[model samples]
Target: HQSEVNKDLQQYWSSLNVVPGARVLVPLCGKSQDMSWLSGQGYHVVGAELSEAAVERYFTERGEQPHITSQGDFKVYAAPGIEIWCGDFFALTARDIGHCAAFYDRAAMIALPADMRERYVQHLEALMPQACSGLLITLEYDQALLEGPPFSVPQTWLHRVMSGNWEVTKVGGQDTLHSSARGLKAGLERMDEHVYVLERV
Candidate 1:
């Protein structure tokens, strides 16, 4: 499953054609391995994680000694060119990120329940300025048959939520097993993984 996630992400980044040294933001970035890859590629990676445990785990497992410091309400882990801010996603401001040029969201947006998705979008809009570009990955499936942290986010709702702030393009999709194997066992009909390219207009 991790390999599949890495494969899709590599493909998504390659498609972006982003210039070297671009600043990128990864939201709800709970110990994701992608941050290291992004930094290795020469992008300055900034991530926000609500879980301090997750942030610590990432640094420890990667054998990175992060310089820890307080930034407003958050504790920041700074290493080389990567920074992980530990706090609420909504609590972060534009000043905290300062006009990031790109975003990579694998699980963050769709991880929330339906009611919170709009609020998430609003906060994201506030943090990102006009002309930002990013890649978003989401799942399309029957929520009636399964519960989720890997939620079922339909295309229609995704469009509705992103309509105002973003120009979204369905870049590609693949039929795959839902990451939550227990959900599948409980009777999920199918899982369609989708990748969308978004530009702030």
Candidate 2:
């Protein structure tokens, strides 16, 4: 299936106040077009994905070739404006991330279960410096009704996990079952998508 840069990111990215040409980290980034969109806006995008094929497709689908190299545990795919690190997310350190100015997480958090979510938050904190901020989008639904890779991540859980290292602010939410067939297929009555602005404390 094809995917598009999320409307939520397009609507709220500027609110993070990230300066042009700064680097933005996208953890668990698959072959997301949002990286391309962010690059078009003048930021260097650092996308971290575990799949090498996905990294290859992210460039090849756009009729571009990436200069490939290895850094620590990752295979790096580099184009003019974007670089994707193909490896485990937990293996990345602040040094690998470098001086990142911001981040944008559309699917990372919700993709994990509870234990992994906690570890993800801790690793994210370890990678970013103070005052770095970004936009995060998550799903909220009756998870009891549906099994998920695109899981429902509630607001309270976001706060409970991230509040120690980041100031999490709920910026927007929408009833999303109308757009999600999975939610409807699972017999869910309510499915919400929430957006947050996270600034490192």
Candidate 3:
């Protein structure tokens, strides 16, 4: 599942008028293609992942090499315009994040269960640099219809979760009725996907 889905980040940034050279944090960055895409556009990509394999794959698949070093209680993987902290996202502090003025979230939010999502948002609010802004991608579906790691994160919950500390904007959405749930997709009435732009208030 090479979901480099957020590849349209340039368009999102252009519309949002995100400042150039901003540091973009990507939680659970994995072996996402979007990191390379963002770095190509000159934004410093800072990400955190739990797996060494994911971090390794991100570099090896691109034919680029990563320089490893120690950072706090974790190992740091550095390349040309990106650095990935390989450890727990919860353990990272402001200094470890290094001026994270913005973030790009694909797998960070929707990947967690309701129990963890609340804490995830809290930590996000607490640690992100002051006045931080971001781009978030999430899924919307019937939880009763399907069980998920890519769970149903409806528009309402999105606001309920992050609207306080950040100004949220619905920038884009796509109908996923045709491509979801394997055989179960046909029974689905609608599966909507969303892109939200966030600016700290």
Candidate 4:
């Protein structure tokens, strides 16, 4: 549902006028098709995933045999120009991703439970260089009705978390099909998916 709803996010990023060969950071990337799209558009793609299964699946689905190598706490899959690091996102340091020009947070922020969101933001802020810009996609729903990986992310909470370090603007939003219909009967008010374009402050 989210994949269909935010399908145009890639087009938005491609139109951002970023420099060729600039590095882009993607957090909690789990076999995301957007990574391939980004690489095809002349950007160096760096995606971090906690699950090794996800990293393997990503390469396998792409039909590319990635060379796996270990460095510190992470195992990296390097295939041609793309790299997927398998480990905790927080375990990565700024040195691991030098001069990242942008970030793509399609599922990372919304995947976490509420309590973990702040740590995710702080780790991202610390790992990324200043002046980076990118798109963020999130879902707003009534969590009381749905226990989820697609958690509800209110606009107010988004502002409070991101306003301190980034200039955020709501680029677009629309009603979309949520993961489960089971929540509908429980008074799940609305499922509003939002996109934000953020530039480092």
Candidate 5:
């Protein structure tokens, strides 16, 4: 499970220039180790997840027992360096994560289907204020090859949806089909992962 920590994070986080101690928002975070990794870097980490069970497992798996309490629409799971709001992402207000300075999205965007992707980004933009920066990782693949939870999101679409509020830059990409057993099984000839740096305007 530790291995699920995306290696691309190390390669891109520093470039966001987020100050230490700043609160970082991780949307749709599903017990991701990235929270622990960011907390280790001295950030106050806030994760938004839909599943209370997943949030519970996150702490328990790390041998921690988070102090729990109810907020407006969420059960807040708080540890020393991290807090996760267990509820729907759309129900979250910026007030829930006051002064969020950075964010990480390894799975959130691609996890949504086409109809919801724009709404997802717009919601994120509304939560983040000017100067907030983040890293977004997305997958690009032939939609016909496989219906996806990890859907194909093109750069053109990302730019169209996010560039008005955030400056979007493609910083890294990799052809991963060779290592993607699912893609191979689905007869996908190509699958690429794209990494982007997002800076709020």
Candidate 6:
């Protein structure tokens, strides 16, 4: 939770005058400061994590207590402006959260393999409100160089996967080869971090 929020994402969404104060979904959210940061930004953050422990620890780390309840097949931990669902991402549906305004895809998309990307995007599209805005971070690298959990998902692929449901605009990208992953990115080269914005139209 100590890690800072990405400056690019801060500039991108806040600059665009994205409507604040509604639920913003963060997929595979884990325990990210980005969630709490966005919560502080007047957004009610709704996050999905695969690990129950992560959800508990996430709230615990922030010195807040959670009120746990069951929704569908998952356990929900809600506190103030944040609500975290612990379970598989695929099980989530739009009905669980109505008219959510925004989304944050910091760890979700890149965590999937190529074969699952399309389905994931489709689910994401369905998960958001009719008119929704989001921030997505991606990495482009030589896939041959490193087998990945932080996979390489280039711009072209992102567009095609989200083709009909979204309008994507490139915010920017930079050489992130120096610290793309935990010691794994050390001197490997060919890693770039890409940022994109999405609005469901």
Query: How do the residues 131-186 of candidate 2 rate in per-residue lDDT, one tens digit apiece?
Result: 55666766665456654555666667878887787787876555665443334546
Model 4, span 32-134: residue lDDT tens? 4556666667776776666665556666787656666555555566556666565445444533563757766654667686668777666666666676676
The most accurate candidate by TM-score is 6
lDDT for predicted candidate 4 compared with the true structure: 0.60
Q: What are the per-residue Cα lDDT tens digits for candidate 1 across 118-182?
A: 77766776677555566676655644554345665666776788667877676545455543232
Q: Write the per-residue lDDT of candidate 3 for residues 31-141, one digit (tens) a residue.
A: 345566566666767777655554556556865556665555555565655565644354445334636467776535676877687677667766766665666766565
1-201, model 6: which lDDT tens digit per residue?
324455665666667656767657777653456676677677767766665665556656865466665555556665554665654354445435526476777545676777787787777777666766777766655344543456656667778777677787776555655433411433446456666777766
The reply for model 4, stretches above 4 Å from the true place, is 1-8, 56-65, 69-75, 94-100, 140-148, 175-192
Q: Taking the candidates one at a time, how many backbone clashes does each contain? A: 0, 0, 0, 0, 0, 0
Model-by-model lDDT, in order?
Answer: 0.61, 0.63, 0.59, 0.60, 0.63, 0.62
TM-scores, one per candidate: 0.70, 0.70, 0.68, 0.70, 0.71, 0.72
Which ranking of candidates, highest lDDT first? 5, 2, 6, 1, 4, 3
* Pairwise TM-score winner, candidates 3 and 4: 4
Q: What TM-score does candidate 2 reach?
A: 0.70
- Candidate 6 — which pairs collide? none
| Total residue pair clashes for candidate 3 | 0
Looking at candidate 1, the ten consecutive residues that score lowest on lDDT are: 177-186
Off by over 4 Å in 3: 1-8, 30-32, 56-65, 69-76, 86-100, 140-148, 175-192
lDDT of 5 by residue, 101-150 (tens): 77776545776776688888887787775556676766666455554457
